[PDB]
Amino acid sequence: QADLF
Amino acid sequence: QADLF
Amino acid sequence: VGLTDLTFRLLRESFADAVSWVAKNLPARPAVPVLSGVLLTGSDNGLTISGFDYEVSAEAQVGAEIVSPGSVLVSGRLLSDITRALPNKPVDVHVEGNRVALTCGNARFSLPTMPVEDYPTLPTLPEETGLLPAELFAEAISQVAIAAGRDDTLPMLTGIRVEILGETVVLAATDRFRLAVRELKWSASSPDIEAAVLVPAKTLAEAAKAGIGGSDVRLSLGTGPGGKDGLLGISGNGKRSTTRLLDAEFPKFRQLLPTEHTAVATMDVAELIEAIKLVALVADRGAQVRMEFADGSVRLSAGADDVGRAEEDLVVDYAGEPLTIAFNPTYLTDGLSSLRSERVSFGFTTAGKSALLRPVSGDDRPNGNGPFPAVSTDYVYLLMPVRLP
Amino acid sequence: VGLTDLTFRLLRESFADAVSWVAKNLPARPAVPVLSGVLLTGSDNGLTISGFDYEVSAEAQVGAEIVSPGSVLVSGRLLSDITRALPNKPVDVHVEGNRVALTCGNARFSLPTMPVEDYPTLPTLPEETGLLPAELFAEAISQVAIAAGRDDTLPMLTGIRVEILGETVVLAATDRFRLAVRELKWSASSPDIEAAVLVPAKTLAEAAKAGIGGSDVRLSLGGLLGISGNGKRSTTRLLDAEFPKFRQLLPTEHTAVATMDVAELIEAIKLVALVADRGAQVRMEFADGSVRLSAGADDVGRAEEDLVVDYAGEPLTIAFNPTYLTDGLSSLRSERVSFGFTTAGKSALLRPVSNGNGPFPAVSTDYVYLLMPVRL
Ligand SMILES: [Ca+2]
Ligand SMILES: [Ca+2]
């Protein structure tokens, strides 16, 4: 999973 | 509680 | 048969219902991986779905168009999850090597398989001992199972005893606090031939609720010798299942049923059930609810000052002198919900002896003072009380 | 004060529904034992049922026949359990000393009480900041709440940020994986009001869901957030955490855009993801006129399904969390969806729906669900 911030 | 047998 | 492995086509709803059927009797939650799967074999005009647990085996046969013979073993829960979520269209299954190609509409699945070499040969069903409507079998097991023991340490109480004499079948279970007996008539293949077996309650209860539909459910015990050893087949409506019986000897239960009652009470079951677990809201630990029987009234009471006290009076058609008796509220409503009648009849003796709950019709029955005999019914739920404060 | 304590009469279902709501979140065995309880207070205006935990307040007003004024504090859970299970008839409640006599039909209860002098005074509501239809508040909270974090071991994600400027209200929540923002307009008293607070998601979600009758919902800011209306009233303590500045995350343009039927896509995701490892990811290969959803490995099985889709831009292969993706699609409450894309490593912008080859601007909408993809 990737992050917005 | 009471028992049958 | 040859090069092309098992490949078939059938409708989704039929495919899914059969796989959902076998997989529910396949909890099989952990390893070994051989036990996690479900095995499909096409032949003739139809498809067979097979599974095994500990003590119960499920096999569901459905019609399918078999373009090529074969068998394949695929994961049980996943293929039941797939076949339920597919669109409503035909399902094409084609075994390719170590995997299975599943095509429904625009959705396609390729799932790995396991060696069919490893799947156990599952028990033979004995010869059919008889059959009864599934809607009667569903209710008969539902009434008797609720009194069966849930324990382990005492295998004797965890089963349902099946007594077969001719066309009459008698079912019984007890946890030593409560006894449930149902007597019914069925279509027997050996009338008259006698037998008594004991089948695990939980499996026989789940198999009955599963079965509701429906066709006539067939029980397979023996030819007999004679009963038989060692299994109970339950077949009908395209499904078939074996459960290993239990060796324990069920108590001789007809000595426990009272021949007489010193006092009897008849009430509305729906109104009493709601009264019990309203009053029992304050009953400490769900222990006991108390019933003070006088004529035309019973007073339900429970609770302690530390949390609360409850009281409710209901109308009763009472015969005999006043009696104050206390029961386990859960055991008490378990019996009342099991009678499946508009009204209930309580056979009483003393506050320390058994109370016999009997189903009574909407309005039939007639009884001045003296001892009242126990009237015959097809069902009996006998409950013994709790010692009063 | 008077010899006769609180005595009243009211319908049971009216009584039961009000007590069930106030009692729902009360603590079972709190360090301060009165919070476990519920406080009943009759007046000319009817009977008021109150609940508190020093953090969240619940107060319900019901019409009742007050035979004598007074208040009483009785165990919360039990009394909602009682009136839910009583027969459908009038309920008579009479406080006798330290006990309460409750009679409905042929049922009678005497329950112990707690000192009414030991109950905290509930917070007063701030002045009303504005009000909006209950149907809109219900829908607005349902859309953004799904993106808030569900684990208090990192609280800053567990809230819903409420930004109020004039008539426009903006609601936002994010778990760092997904951001949901909805803009709505409400009737504010007065114009030029500007405030921004961050409220625990779960409670603010419960107040919205419990509020579909609906009447009109009033929000009061002054810290605590009041939610009043339809005979019910509640204050919630805000959260101290800093909410991310979230509008830098929303793309103004997209390299590719796609519009699909949501009901068709939701069913496709759920079925394809059955073989997805850990429910981790679903792959989507966007080409023109088609998307191919795929998941799974030789681990369990693999699944693929193709869907029809209006596509603009160059083909893109991107993978999302199936649970996070279906959460967003369910939030649009529209027949179709619009996907703003850039790269397989950047955010995808979902939008409710009823150019040339160049970069496509993001069309303005009241709701946006922005989701981050998975590796590949
Ligand atoms: Ca409300
Ligand atoms: Ca971003």
DSSP string across D199-259: EEHHHHHHHHHTT-S-SEEEEEE--EEEEEETTEEEEEE---SPPP--TTSS-SEESEEEE
Distance from CA of D131 to the nearest CA of C (A): 40
Give the experimental resolution in Å: 2.7
H/E run at residue C91: strand C90-96
What span, in angstroms and rounded, lies between the C-alpha atoms of D8 and D93?
5
Which residues of chain D have a CB within 8 Å of the CB of C85? 267, 270-271, 274
Phi first, then psi, for residue C83 (nearest 5°) are -65, -20
Cβ distance of C176 and B4 shorter than 8 Å = yes
Q: How many residues would you count in chain B?
A: 5
Contact: D244, A5; criterion CB under 8 Å? yes
Q: How far apart are CA C72 and CA C50, in angstroms?
A: 11
Identify the H or E element spanning D323. Answer: helix D322-332
- CB neighbourhood size of D54 (10 A): 12
Contact C242, C123 (CB under 8 A): yes
Beta bridge partners of C131: C187, C218
Phi, psi of D374 (to 5 degrees): -120, 160
C296 three-state secondary structure: coil
For chain C, what is the radius of gyration of the CA atoms? 26
Instruction: Give the residue carrying structure tokens 């239960």.
Output: C253
Q: Secondary structure of D5-24 in the HEC alphabet?
A: CCEEEECHHHHHHHHHHHHC
Cβ(D235)–Cβ(D308) below 8 Å: no
CB of D231 closer than 8 Å to CB of D307: no
Give, for D270, the enclosing helix (H) or strand (E). Answer: helix D262-272
Residue in chain D nearest A5 by alpha carbon: D176
Which residue's structure tokens are 């007073």?
A: C299
Which chains pack against C, by 3+ Cβ pairs within 8 A? B, D
CA angle, residues D261, D263, D268, in degrees to nearest 5: 95
Distance CA C315, CA C325 (A): 16
Whether D255 and D358 have beta carbons less than 8 Å apart is answered as no
Q: Which residues of C touch D (CB under 8 A)?
A: 75, 78, 81-82, 85-87, 106-112, 274-275, 277-279, 281-282, 305-314
D109 Cβ contact list (under 8 Å, min separation 6) = C282, C308, C309, C310, C311, D82, D100, D101, D102, D103
Cβ contact C245:C232 at 8 Å: yes
Is-contact D296 D336, C-beta < 8 A?
A: no
Q: CA-to-CA distance for D106 and D110, rounded, in angstroms?
A: 14
- Give the Cα separation of D66 and D8 in Å (integer): 4
Nearest to residue C40, comparing CAs of C83, C74, C85, C2?
Answer: C74
Contact indicator for C364, C253 with CB cutoff of 8 Å = no
Per DSSP, the residues of C218-286 read: EEE--S-----SSEEEEEETTEEEEEE---SPPP-GGGTS-SEESEEEEEEHHHHHHHHHHHGGGSGGG
CA-wise closest residue to C356 among C182, C201, C184, C180: C180
Q: Which residue has tokens 């003796």?
A: C349
Spatial separation of the C-alpha atoms in residues D20 and C83, rounded to whole Å: 41
What is the residue whose two structure tokens read 């409560």?
Answer: C178
Q: How near does any CA of chain B get to the CA of C142, in Å?
A: 21
Choose among D268, D294, D282, D242: nearest CA to D371: D282
C-beta of residue D305 within 8 angstroms of C-beta of residue D325: no
- Token duo for residue C43: 């032949």
Per DSSP, the three-state class of C297 is: strand
In angstroms, rounded to a whole number, what is the distance separating the alpha carbons of residues C157 and C212? Answer: 25
Do residues A3 and D176 lie in contact, with contact meaning Cβ atoms separated by under 8 Å? Answer: yes
Residue C214 neighbours by CB under 8 Å, 6+ apart: C134, C135, C236, C237
Nearest to C110 among D86, D107, D301 (CB): D301
Nearest to C107 among D78, D109, D305 (CB): D305
CB nearest B5 (choices: C256, C328, C352):
C256
3-state secondary structure labels for all residues of C310-359: EEEEECCEEECCCEEEEECHHHHHHHHHHHCCCEEEEEECCCCCCEEEEE
**Tokens (6 digits) for C270:** 């729906």
Collect all residues with Cβ–Cβ distance below 8 Å to D132 and sequence separation of at least 6: D169, D184, D186, D187, D216, D217, D219
CA-nearest of C290, C285, C196, C289 to C249 is C196
Hey, are the CB atoms on A1 and D179 less than 8 Å from each other? Answer: no
**Pairwise CA distance, residues C312 & C298, whole Å:** 8
Distance of CA C117 to the CA centre of its chain: 34
Q: Work out the burial of residue D287: count CB atoms within 10 Å of its CB; fewer than 13 is exposed, 13-18 middle, 19 or more buried.
A: middle
Give the Å distance between the CA of D239 and the centre of ligand 2.
Answer: 25
- Residues D230 and D211: their CA atoms lie apart, in Å, by 8
Question: Where do the domains of chain C lie, and which CATH numbers do they carry?
Answer: 1-126 (3.10.150.10), 127-256 (3.10.150.10), 257-389 (3.10.150.10)
Q: C85–D110: do the CB atoms touch at under 8 Å?
A: no
Calculate the CA D322 to chain-centre distance.
Answer: 22
- Chain A residues within 8 A of D374 when measuring between CB atoms: 1-2
Element (H, E) at D135: helix D134-145
Contact D100, D94 (CB under 8 A): yes
Print burial letters for C3-16: b (CB count within 10 Å at least 16), e (below 16).
eebbbbbbbbebbb
Nearest partner of D291 among D308, D274, D303, D276, judged by Cα: D308
Give the integer Cα–Cα distance in Å for D296 and D300: 7
Note whether C320 and C263 are within 8 A (CB): yes
Q: Extract the tokens encoding C369.
A: 């003072």
D→A interface, C-beta within 8 Å: 174, 176-179, 244, 249, 321, 345, 347, 370, 372-375
Buried b (16+ CB within 10 A) or exposed e, D139-165: bbbbbbbbbbbeeeeeebbbbbbbbbe
Indicate which of C84, C86, C106 best probes the interface with D, i.e. most D CBs within 10 Å of its own CB: C106
Q: Would you call C78 and D301 a contact, using CB atoms and an 8 Å cutoff?
A: yes
What tokens does D123 get? 């917070």
* CA torsion, ordered D3, D6, D11, D15, to nearest 10 deg: -160
Query: Contact at 8 Å (CB) between D182 and D250?
Result: no
Which residue carries 């819903």 as its tokens? D160
In whole angstroms, give the CA distance from residue D261 to residue D334. Answer: 9
Phi, psi (5° rounding) for residue D3? Answer: -70, -50
Flag if A4 and D174 touch (Cβ within 8 Å): yes
Beta strands in D88-215 (DSSP E): 91-96, 99-104, 107-114, 128-133, 159-165, 168-174, 178-185, 187-188, 194-200
> How far is CA D135 from each of CA B4, D114, D186, rounded to the nearest angstrom?
59, 38, 12
DSSP C7-74: EEEEEHHHHHHHHHHHHHT----SS-HHHHEEEEEEETTEEEEEEE-SSEEEEEEEE-EEEE-EEEEE
Q: Tell me the C-alpha distance between C337 and C332, whole Å.
A: 9
Cα distance between residue C249 and residue D43, in whole Å: 67
